[PDB]
Design a protein around this ligand. Structure first.
Ligand code: BCB
Ligand code: BCB
Ligand code: BCB
Ligand SMILES: C/C=C1/c2cc3[nH]c4c(c3C)C(=O)[C@H](C(=O)OC)c4c3nc(cc4[nH]c(cc(n2)[C@@H]1C)c(C(C)=O)c4C)[C@@H](C)[C@@H]3CCC(=O)OC/C=C(/C)CCC[C@H](C)CCC[C@H](C)CCCC(C)C
Ligand SMILES: C/C=C1/c2cc3[nH]c4c(c3C)C(=O)[C@H](C(=O)OC)c4c3nc(cc4[nH]c(cc(n2)[C@@H]1C)c(C(C)=O)c4C)[C@@H](C)[C@@H]3CCC(=O)OC/C=C(\C)CCC[C@H](C)CCC[C@H](C)CCCC(C)C
Ligand SMILES: CC(C)=CCC/C(C)=C/CC/C(C)=C/CC/C(C)=C/CC/C(C)=C/CC/C(C)=C/CC/C(C)=C/CC1=C(C)C(=O)c2ccccc2C1=O
Ligand code: HEC
Ligand code: HEC
Ligand code: HEC
Ligand code: HEC
Ligand SMILES: CC(C)=CCC/C(C)=C/C=C/C(C)=C/C=C/C(C)=C/C=C\C=C(C)\C=C\C=C(/C)CC/C=C(/C)CCCC(C)C
Ligand SMILES: CCCCCCCCCCCC[N+](C)(C)[O-]
Ligand SMILES: CCCCCCCCCCCC[N+](C)(C)[O-]
Ligand SMILES: CCCCCCCCCCCC[N+](C)(C)[O-]
Ligand SMILES: [Fe+2]
Lengths: 332, 273, 258, 323
């Protein structure tokens, strides 16, 4: 039922506004230990010999690297994505240039995606960046992904009950609730807001009085858009392990300036990054994946805020390997 | 000065402290020792509000705000401008409220009536202490308390609720709200009933206790009765805060997640998961 | 263009704000605060001597009279002329306007301070169909004590001093509300009966405790005119007597607790 | 202490009173029975109940509304009876999600909601007639029914009048435990923070005021129960020491006082004004105000605060930023 004291608290607004984080130390510690499993950087190797574009046969992305650099990259990739399966998860034992296993081609696209994240989306990931580990956490299937309908459990490493399974229709409301922090909001914010750029998140008018021509009948956005935005915000909050006041002064949710924290602006860029990743990198992979990875509408698994963050405001508490692996970005 | 029936009741005695020294009226107001302490604390509190407000940006009464300190000052004293005024004003408020309560005790004893009114008035004092003293003690800073301003205190209530994602799902809040609503309904029913009996209209005759009970037996199959609706009314009203206080105290010290998630105790029982 | 906009920075909601305040203050000041003045007004000063014309404020603060048509005949009009006739056994402790009065005699018998009664009708309160409302069980033979509760008939009445003061002979019941309001008791060693309101009675299984008065003080409890019925004024007299005890039963009760 | 103010020490039993009304004396059904434990804190008698046409009509229309809701709730869990009990709080019947305007929505998206709305409204109206007419029948004023009328009016404001005035059924209150709650936040968000709606303020002021008054009034009557203060009708028509003491308690405390009758007018008015104020706020919302916070800013009322963490410009309005 309850969580024993003390609580850790922070301040995110002017004194007396009750803005800030509220954290249970035991929960923070458990997430710290889970995220501390991030393998250390492999020892640096000296750049020696010709570029692997001249040495190897089928290197399209990492061709600028030397042999020792490149094999270091491949050892790191293995540790991050497929430590239990090994090099043979993506490779034929007898022909390392063969693309015959699907994880090879997917991994190539993931290399491009990861490079794009660290080069084009610095507005969100800053100097911290992402590696393969940020999402994958040492398994080929990342633990936190989304289909075009909600699924339980959130962590796909846990085994679903009969009701949790997506085909059991009686469990739909619970599947949806647990994606919106246990609210009864009847909207799936992933498919509405994060799968593509079709919907506007903002719903609050920016005028005191209702403007003539947008304020009556079918001219109006239905109230459902406000429920859906709220549902997105519940989901976002839970995915970062925080609350609304981390980003907003609830006096005016719609206002920027002093009414928002810098974290709100970073989150804004995050919505755009996730849309780019889903539309242009992750959703097209349904062609290259087996049918047992696809969802019930032939969709590839896609990313939300949780995919990287996993209940923490900075993924892996701000741990970085950017300097240790220049080949993952930023690229000049 | 005096109501037509008043003089016979205006006798000496009933005080808790000081005997005859403060046992007198000024206009309609009984004074007593706690009349004197109340005025002291009021004057001091209103002075501190005036002085603090003048050092602030504005004089618009809707926008004035005396705020507690930053969280970093913990349970210590803070510099006057940055939380100390709030601290002093808070002490004066408690002085004034408790004085006001104890004065009502003295007035009750003089009239030979029950102490039920001051008793009832302890409830909102208690709730003020929950918000400003007890909950801030449990979290380790005065900075978690509410600011003194007409509109600013609503911004605090607002953000405090959204700190727990959806405060409507707080079970102590659900109880509190339910008692707020049923109390307001019940006051309307009771007020309406009494007026309906004494004022049937059109020169018709004043009805009776039996009519009162007949009306509610007819409409809902039960009438609690004349004395008991007064007991119930006090119970309903008092429980707005008595139950509410648990939902307030729980948020932060005994629960750090969103309030909807709390209902996992029900939803996630393995039997039906 | 804007829904709700009017000329010169005005809008509809801004006007309704002013109107709402006007409604509230009108109802509060002109209606409710005058309804509040239907008892005890006009106020009494150190001698309101101007017998030939009324002060303007005293007329303005009163509502128009209303007349209640009573259920068993008669009418009552409020507000009305009701000065308190009876001589009060009280003396001014000082010359100041708001100084307390002191009892000159025995305040319980003299009926001053918390011993005071209101000047209600010397009329028996009635049921919906004309019968006396408050009557002892000897008369209300179709009423009974509920199965489970103490029957106090037979039990002794112990006063504040711990002395047995009498024996409970009957309960008086409200026939309109089905609720006991008084116990009747014989005052031991005085050859008389006395009523006590239940609110002054701690009902135990073997005794009735009464902390409001001493045993000796049961002698001077206001007597009723009739044995088997009570008037509204007598109800006030009886109830007030015990209440007076809370402040006056001993000298120490009027003094400070600290 | 007066133990009578806590509970009835000795309960009384006697023949059941029946006050005759101008009609319907035969429509009183059931035989009265008595509860000893209820009788500790109340009147022991339960029943009979009056069972007229308006009451039966109310039960009929209400049950129909309840059944429409429960069926749609059950459909939401594909009729699994166990998941129905589990998820009950989270289930609901929703107004249209799509913008049809005032158009009658399809049954799958809000038509069932509209139906349940109709039958509840007819149920409230039928009960209102019961509340009014029973008063007339027993020769009582209609004060309760006018207070109740304001409560029904408020329901109609949030249920259909506000939707009509802006022209979208999508803005109605869903049926369900958590879903009717969720509406409150969606509505407050849509209209720019309800804390900044003055009529929200007024309603709250009166609602808190009802708390204050019933606590103070209840306590007052209990404090003068020794002198028969509970017998309020005859204390009005013939002032007793109960109400003299009560009046002087308040006069000496706060400088002024009510009468035993007028305090009931105060309470009745406060209760009424919770609902009247709420209704005025909803009628103005969407119709004449779109963002209550910005409206308060326009009229110079909103508080402002320094930045704590840095002020953060809207990224959408930076040059070269994406959509
Ligand atoms: C987004 C934010 C939310 C929120 C956040 C919230 C919080 C954080 C808290 C509440 C609480 C409460 N909320 Mg609430 N809330 C409520 C109702 C309530 C109250 C019943 C309850 C108690 C308030 C209180 O502590 O008063 C306090 C009043 C006091 C202390 C009065 C003190 C009086 C003092 C002794 C005397 C003062 C004297 C004057 C200075 C003298 C001057 C007089 C002049 C005239 C001379 C309703 C009916 C709704 C609706 C309709 O949606 C709602 C929505 C929300 N609440 C939002 C979802 N609410 C409280 C609660 O109990 O929660 C469980 C609480 O802590
Ligand atoms: C847990 C949540 C809380 C809460 C949530 C809340 C909400 C959501 C809303 C209010 C509103 C109000 N609150 Mg508030 N509140 C207030 C006072 C107020 C008033 C400004 C206003 C109307 C209240 C009312 O009529 O009550 C019933 C009492 C009545 C009718 C008697 C008359 C009281 C009188 C109007 C109070 C005036 C107070 C003075 C302006 C302050 C004292 C000044 C000094 C210098 C003498 C006090 C004095 C306190 C204290 C001491 O604890 C308090 C605590 C709380 N409020 C908690 C922090 N309050 C409403 C408002 O309109 O805000 C602007 C409103 O919408
Ligand atoms: C984030 C969301 C917010 C919110 C959103 C909100 C909205 C959207 C509305 C309110 C409204 C109100 N809010 Mg509020 N609110 C309130 C208090 C209040 C109420 C006094 C007031 C009136 C509602 C009412 O009494 O309904 C209870 C009474 C009702 C519903 C009447 C029902 C009577 C009916 C005849 C009963 C019949 C039932 C049948 C027997 C059953 C049949 C059903 C079957 C057939 C299915 C407090 C004290 C607080 C605090 C402390 O923070 C708060 C915060 C918030 N509110 C947040 C700012 N609030 C209302 C208002 O005043 O707006 C201006 C309103 O419309
Ligand atoms: C400030 C003003 C307040 C206010 C005022 C007033 N509110 C009144 C009156 C006034 C004046 C009455 O005259 C009337 C009444 O009659 O009172 C005894 C009534 C009502 N306010 C109810 C509910 C409510 N008020 C709420 C709010 C506010 N109200 C606001 C706060 C809320 C909230 C908070 O959401 C709720 C849920 C119902 C009990 C009732 C309507 C029944 C109905 O419309 O039937 C509709 C038909 C049905 C079939 C529903 C059946 C179930 C209900 C519980 C009825 C069952 C009764 C039946 C007799 C049970 C059998 C018992 C027997 C076997 C022993
Ligand atoms: C469930 C229980 C209910 C309840 C019960 C009862 N309520 C009672 C009694 C009972 C029984 C009385 O016996 C007593 C009284 O006499 O009645 C006329 C009283 C009273 N209820 C008042 C206010 C009230 N009740 C509220 C709530 C409930 N009441 C709940 C609902 C609320 C809100 C907010 O809801 C308000 C505002 C005063 C009018 C009065 C105290 C006067 C005082 O104490 O004088 C002494 C103090 C002063 C005159 C001023 C002090 C100024 C200080 C020093 C400086 C200001 C500091 C302040 C903290 C700044 C805040 C700013 C603000 C914008 C945030
Ligand atoms: C200058 C100086 C040295 C003075 C010394 C003396 C001294 C201590 C003075 C105090 C001065 C101060 C601080 C005065 C302020 C007084 C205050 C707090 C006033 C607040 C008034 C408010 C807003 C009350 C809200 C409640 C309200 C709406 C009440 C209206 C209705 C009334 C009057 C209810 C009280 C009341 C109730 C509740 C009954 O049940 C009852 C039953 C039968 C008869 C009468 C009554 C009755 O009067
Ligand atoms: C999927 C997550 C992979 C794992 C695990 C390993 N490799 Fe890999 N490798 C992968 C890709 C997509 C590519 C193409 C890279 C590009 O820039 O286009 C490669 C490439 C190689 C090569 C070069 C082969 C050639 O073209 O001749 C070598 C020598 C190689 N990989 C070796 C290697 C080893 C030793 C691994 C385990 C420690 C390993 N790889 C893992 C994808 C994946
Ligand atoms: C989140 C932004 C991710 C980052 C960074 C990387 N990957 Fe990824 N990957 C992600 C998703 C959502 C998916 C789809 C789920 C799936 O299992 O297909 C994938 C998929 C892969 C795969 C295929 C795994 C399989 O289906 O068996 C591989 C081989 C893979 N990803 C590798 C990979 C590498 C090498 C990365 C770093 C350069 C990398 N991914 C980053 C999400 C994210
Ligand atoms: C940071 C990680 C955030 C948290 C936590 C919450 N919100 Fe938020 N919100 C955030 C952003 C970046 C945006 C803008 C989205 C865009 O694409 O422009 C929003 C938006 C809102 C809105 C709509 C505001 C408008 O202009 O209409 C609302 C009403 C809102 N947010 C509310 C809200 C609530 C209630 C939250 C806690 C449950 C919450 N947000 C969290 C960033 C972040
Ligand atoms: C991996 C590709 C990510 C996805 C998907 C999302 N975020 Fe993220 N975020 C990521 C990184 C690497 C960082 C940097 C951490 C650092 O040390 O700087 C962030 C940062 C944030 C922040 C700022 C947190 C802070 O300053 O304390 C916020 C508020 C945030 N991210 C929110 C957010 C949201 C709402 C997302 C879904 C739209 C989201 N992020 C996705 C990595 C990734
Ligand atoms: C012309 C025609 C076609 C259009 C107009 C029709 C019309 C007038 C529609 C009006 C609709 C209105 C006023 C809708 C209002 C809806 C509102 C305010 C709903 C509010 C709350 C709903 C709740 C709490 C629903 C709860 C539902 C359940 C618990 C399931 C039902 C079962 C029950 C036992 C009910 C118990 C409710 C409670 C006593 C605990
Ligand atoms: C809008 C409400 C419509 C409900 C119609 C059904 C109620 C019937 C009313 C009968 C009233 C009879 N009467 C006046 C003698 O009580
Ligand atoms: C609870 C919300 C209370 C908000 C009160 C704000 C009302 C502003 C009305 C201002 C009146 C017009 N004018 C000209 C003075 O600005
Ligand atoms: C926000 C709700 C406002 C409610 C206002 C009601 C306050 C009662 C005013 C009592 C005034 C007393 N007196 C003697 C000056 O009339
Ligand atoms: Fe009453």
């Amino acid at each position: 039922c309850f969580e024993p004291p003390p609580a850790t608290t922070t301040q995110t607004g002017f004194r007396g506004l009750s803005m800030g984080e509220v954290l249970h130390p035991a929960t923070v510690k458990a997430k710290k230990e889970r995220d501390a499993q991030y393998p250390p950087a492999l020892a640096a190797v000296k750049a020696e010999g010709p570029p692997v574009s001249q040495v190897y046969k089928n290197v399209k992305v990492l061709g600028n690297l030397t042999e020792a650099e490149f094999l270091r990259t491949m050892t790191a990739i293995t540790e991050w994505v497929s430590p239990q399966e090994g090099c043979t998860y993506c490779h034929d034992e007898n022909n390392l240039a063969s693309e015959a296993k699907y994880p090879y081609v997917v991994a190539r696209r993931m290399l491009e995606m990861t490079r794009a994240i660290n080069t084009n989306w610095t507005q969100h990931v800053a100097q911290t960046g992402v590696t393969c580990y940020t999402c994958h956490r040492g398994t080929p299937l990342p633990p936190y992904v989304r289909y075009l309908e909600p699924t339980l459990p959130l962590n796909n490493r846990e085994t679903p009950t009969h009701v949790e399974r997506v085909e059991t229709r009686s469990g739909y409301v619970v599947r949806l609730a647990k994606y919106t922090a246990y609210s009864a909001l009847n909207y799936d914010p992933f498919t509405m807001f994060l799968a593509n750029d079709k919907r506007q998140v903002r719903v609050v008018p920016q005028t005191a009085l209702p403007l003539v021509g947008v304020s009556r009948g079918k001219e109006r956005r239905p109230l459902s858009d406000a429920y859906a935005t709220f549902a997105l915000m519940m989901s976002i909050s839970d995915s970062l392990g925080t609350n609304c006041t981390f980003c907003h002064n609830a006096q005016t949710f719609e206002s920027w300036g002093k009414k928002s924290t810098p974290q709100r602006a970073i989150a804004w860029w995050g919505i755009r990054m996730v849309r780019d990743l889903n539309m242009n990198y992750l959703a097209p992979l349904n062609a290259s994946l087996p049918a047992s990875r696809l969802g019930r509408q032939g969709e590839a698994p896609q990313a939300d805020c949780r995919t990287c963050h996993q209940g923490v405001t900075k993924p892996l508490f701000g741990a970085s390997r950017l300097k240790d692996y220049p080949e993952l970005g930023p690229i000049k | 000065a005096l109501l037509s029936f008043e003089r016979k009741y205006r006798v000496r005695g009933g005080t808790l402290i000081g005997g005859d020294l403060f046992d007198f009226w000024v206009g309609p107001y009984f004074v007593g020792f706690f009349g004197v302490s109340a005025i002291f604390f009021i004057f001091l509190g209103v002075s501190l509000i005036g002085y603090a407000a003048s050092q602030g940006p504005t004089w618009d009464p809707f926008a004035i705000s005396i705020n507690p300190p930053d969280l970093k000052y913990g349970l210590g004293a803070a510099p006057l401008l940055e939380g100390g005024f709030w601290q002093a004003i808070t002490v004066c408020a408690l002085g004034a409220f408790i004085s006001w309560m104890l004065r009502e005790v003295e007035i009750s004893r003089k009239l030979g009536i029950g102490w039920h009114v001051p008793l009832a008035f302890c409830v909102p004092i208690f709730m003020f202490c929950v918000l400003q003293v007890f909950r801030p003690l449990l979290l380790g800073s005065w900075g978690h308390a509410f600011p003194y301003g007409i509109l600013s205190h609503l911004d605090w209530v607002n953000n405090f609720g959204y700190q727990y994602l959806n405060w409507h799902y707080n079970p102590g809040h659900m109880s509190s709200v339910s008692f707020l609503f049923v109390n307001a309904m019940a006051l309307g029913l009771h007020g309406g009933l009494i007026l309906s009996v004494a004022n049937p209209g059109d020169g018709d005759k004043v009805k009776t206790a039996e009519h009162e009970n007949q009306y509610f037996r007819d409409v809902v199959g039960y009438s609690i009765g004349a004395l008991s609706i007064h007991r119930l009314g006090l119970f309903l009203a008092s429980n707005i805060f008595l139950t509410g206080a648990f939902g307030t105290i729980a948020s932060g010290p005994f629960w750090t997640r969103g309030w909807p998630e709390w209902w996992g105790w029900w939803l996630d029982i393995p039997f039906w998961s | 263009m804007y829904h709700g906009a009017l000329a010169q920075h005005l809008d509809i909601a801004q006007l309704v704000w002013y109107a709402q305040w006007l409604v509230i203050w009108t109802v509060v000041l002109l209606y409710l605060r005058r309804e509040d003045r239907r008892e005890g007004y006009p106020l009494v000063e150190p001698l309101g001597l101007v017998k030939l014309a009324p002060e303007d404020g005293q007329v303005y603060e009163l509502p128009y009279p209303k007349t209640f048509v009573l259920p068993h005949g008669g009418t009552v009009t409020v507000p009305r002329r009701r000065p308190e006739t009876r001589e009060l056994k009280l003396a001014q402790t000082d010359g100041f306007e708001g100084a307390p009065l002191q009892p000159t005699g025995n305040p319980l018998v003299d009926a001053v301070g918390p011993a005071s009664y209101a000047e209600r009708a010397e009329v028996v309160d009635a049921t919906v169909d004309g019968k006396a409302k408050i009557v002892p069980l000897r008369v209300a033979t179709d009423f009974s004590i509920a199965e489970g509760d103490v029957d106090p008939r037979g039990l002794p009445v112990v006063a504040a001093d711990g002395v047995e003061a009498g024996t409970v002979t009957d309960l008086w019941v409200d026939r309109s509300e089905h609720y006991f309001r008084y116990l009747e008791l014989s005052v031991a060693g005085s050859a008389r009966t006395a009523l006590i309101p239940l609110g002054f009675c701690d009902v135990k299984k073997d005794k009735i405790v009464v902390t409001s008065i001493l045993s000796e003080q049961f002698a001077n409890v206001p007597r009723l005119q009739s044995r088997d019925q009570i008037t509204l004024r007598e109800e006030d007299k009886v109830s007030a007597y015990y209440a007076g005890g809370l402040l006056y039963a001993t000298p120490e009760r009027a003094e400070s607790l600290l | 202490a007066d133990y009578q103010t806590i509970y009835t020490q000795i309960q009384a039993r006697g023949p059941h009173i029946t006050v005759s009304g101008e009609w319907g004396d035969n429509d009183r059904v059931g035989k009265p029975f008595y509860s000893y434990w209820l009788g500790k804190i109340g009147d022991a008698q339960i029943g009979p109940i009056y069972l007229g046409a308006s009451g039966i009509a109310a039960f009929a229309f209400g049950s129909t509304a309840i059944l429409i809701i429960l069926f749609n709730m059950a459909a939401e869990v594909h009729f699994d009876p166990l998941q129905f009990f589990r998820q009950f709080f989270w289930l609901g019947l929703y107004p249209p999600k799509a913008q049809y305007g005032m158009g009658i929505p399809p049954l799958h998206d809000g038509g069932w909601w509209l139906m349940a709305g109709l039958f509840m409204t007819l149920s409230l109206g039928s009960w209102w007639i019961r509340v009014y007419s029973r008063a007339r029948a027993l020769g009582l004023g209609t004060h309760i029914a006018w207070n109740f009328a304001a409560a029904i009016f408020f329901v109609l404001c949030i249920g259909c009048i506000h939707p009509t005035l802006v022209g979208s059924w999508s803005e109605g209150v869903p049926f369900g435990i958590w879903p009717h709650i969720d509406w409150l936040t969606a509505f407050s968000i849509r209209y720019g923070n309800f804390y900044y709606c003055p009529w929200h303020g007024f309603s709250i002021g009166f609602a808190y005021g009802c708390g204050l008054l019933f606590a103070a009034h209840g306590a007052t009557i209990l404090a003068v129960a020794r002198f028969g203060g509970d017998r309020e009708i005859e204390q009005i028509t013939d002032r007793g020491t109960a109400v003299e003491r009560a009046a002087l308690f308040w006069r000496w405390t706060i400088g002024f006082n009510a009468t035993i009758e007028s305090v009931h007018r105060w309470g009745w008015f406060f209760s009424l004004m919770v609902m009247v104020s709420a209704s005025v706020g909803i009628l103005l919302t969407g119709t004449f105000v779109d963002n209550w916070y910005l409206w308060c800013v326009k009229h110079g009322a909103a508080p402002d605060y320094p930045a704590y963490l840095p002020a953060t410009p809207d990224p959408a309005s930076l040059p070269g930023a994406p959509k």
